[PDB]
Amino acid sequence: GDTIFGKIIRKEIPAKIIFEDDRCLAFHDISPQAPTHFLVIPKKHISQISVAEDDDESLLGHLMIVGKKCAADLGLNKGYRMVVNEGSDGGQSVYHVNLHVLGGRQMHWPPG
Amino acid sequence: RPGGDTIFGKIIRKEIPAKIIFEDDRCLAFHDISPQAPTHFLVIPKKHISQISVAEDDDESLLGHLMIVGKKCAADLGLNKGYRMVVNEGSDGGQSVYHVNLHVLGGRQMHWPPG
Ligand SMILES: Nc1nc(=O)c2ncn([C@@H]3O[C@H](CSP(=O)(O)NCCc4c[nH]c5ccccc45)[C@@H](O)[C@H]3O)c2[nH]1
Ligand SMILES: [Cl-]
Secondary structure: OOOHHHHHHOOOOOOOEEEEOOOEEEEEOOOOOOOEEEEEEEOOOOOOHHHOOHHHHHHHHHHHHHHHHHHHHOOOOOOEEEEEEEOOOOOOOOOOOOEEEEEOOOOOOOOO | OOOOOOHHHHHHOOOOOOOEEEEOOOEEEEEOOOOOOOEEEEEEEOOOOOOHHHOOHHHHHHHHHHHHHHHHHHHHOOOOOOEEEEEEEHHHHOOOOOOOOEEEEEOOOOOOOOO
């Protein structure tokens, strides 16, 4: 089923885009939890990490490499936290795989 | 020594004990000694990478493999209601061991924000 992130990929609703390529999109989160809080998502609709296939390995790693490169470009020189949520207990809010990157403040422990 | 001399390199080489869940030629999954959830484990590469901010472009498949292994281990451990994956970078991220590691936390409701 389509999600709001599909609409963002298709440019049907606005988002503040940080980076795009042929296979992923990075954009600022609409409900930021840190001074910098953005998402990196694949253009392929994988609904949740639990259903990712083995052949998706390089794509998932691509999200992390894009995320760390975007974090550097956004000035997160003191560090950041990357998060993927799965399901109800994980607090997943949109059923399209999305890598959160949060920084610009001290991130605390436990991570939720 | 392959893997480095952080605690995680020692664990990779069986020089310090750990409760191992899964092991292959690229990574190792093992339980966290200070769990923050009823199930809390780590997935680490066997290749030493100090932190995600210095990972190389050719590390993409390895980093993705950590997540695939993480989700497969989570299923094997019965985390059917979900879980959260975390990577900490640098001081603001809360990094304390400079060997890349992916946390998997589940068995309770995780809250927002994630720290
Ligand atoms: N099985 C096992 N054996 C060990 O010898 C050992 N030593 C550390 N750890 C666990 O590694 C995990 C990952 S380190 P990180 O850089 O993501 N910082 C994570 C927050 C953080 C900042 N400072 C800290 C101090 C203590 C614990 C966590 C913290 C932590 O969650 C340790 O618990 C171990 N696990
Ligand atoms: Cl989410």
